[PDB]
Symmetry: none
Subunit: 145 residues, 2 copies
Amino acid sequence: MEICPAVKRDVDLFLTGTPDEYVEQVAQYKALPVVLENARILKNCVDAKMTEEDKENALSLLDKIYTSPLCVKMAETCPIFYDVFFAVANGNELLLDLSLTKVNATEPERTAMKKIQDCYVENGLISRVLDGLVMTTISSSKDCM
Amino acid sequence: MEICPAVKRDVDLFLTGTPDEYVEQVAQYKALPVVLENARILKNCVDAKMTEEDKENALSLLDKIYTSPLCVKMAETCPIFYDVFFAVANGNELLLDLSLTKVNATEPERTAMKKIQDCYVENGLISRVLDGLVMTTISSSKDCMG
C-alpha cells in the first residue's frame, strides 16, 4: 500500500529542510533528548556529505520506491521502503544494495543512498541510534490510518 | 552568530573520527592530493599526541567557544572560533592564549589546544596548504551559505 504521507514528509524534511526544522518535526513524534541529539547529528552529517546533486538523486530514488509495485501493490504499507530504511539505519550495505536493485536504482542514486547509510555508520552512530523508535512512532500514528 | 554546523562537524570528526572518516570528510570539500596528504599527517599526529582526556578537554573548550557571546552575539559567524582555529593552525601561541582567556579556558583545556597547535608546528604545516583552504571552503559552502 502507498506510504503514509507523514512518513514521506519526514524523509523529505530530513533531506531538504534546515536542521532546526527537521529536528523540531522529529520532536513532535518523540521528544527524548537522545533522539533529538541523534537526529541533529545525522541531519548535519547528511547535509555536509551530500551535494545538491546527491540530494536530487536520493529524492529520485525515493520516488522509485514510493511508486514501485513492491511498495504500492502490497497488502501492507510500502514494504520496500522500510526494508531500505532499516538497511540504511543499520549499515547493512548488502541488503541496501539488494533492495535498490529491486527498484531499478541508477549508480548515482545508489551513491546517494550509501551517503545516508555512511552517516549512520559514521563516528559509531549505528551503535547509538534507536532505529525504529521515530519511524515506528510516525508509522503507527493516528495520522497514518 | 552561531557557527555553521558543517564547521562544528569538521572539528568534531577531526578530534573523534577515525583518520579515514576525517580525511574523507576533508576530501568532500577539497580533493587536492596535497591537502589530503597533509590532513592525514595532522590527524595521525593529533590521535597519537592527545589522550582521551585531552580530546575531552578540547571538546569542552570548543563548547565554550560555540556558546560564548564573542561567538553568538556578534554580527557575523562565530568570530572567536576563527581566531582560535587560525591561531592554532599557524602556530601563533600568543594569540591562542589571549583568545583562550576570552572564553575562560581551564588549564587542561589550554594544554589540550596547545597539543593540536604543536601538531601543526612540529610537522612543518604552518607554511603548508591545509586548513586555510579547507576551513575557508567549509565556512563559505552553500550549506553554511557563507
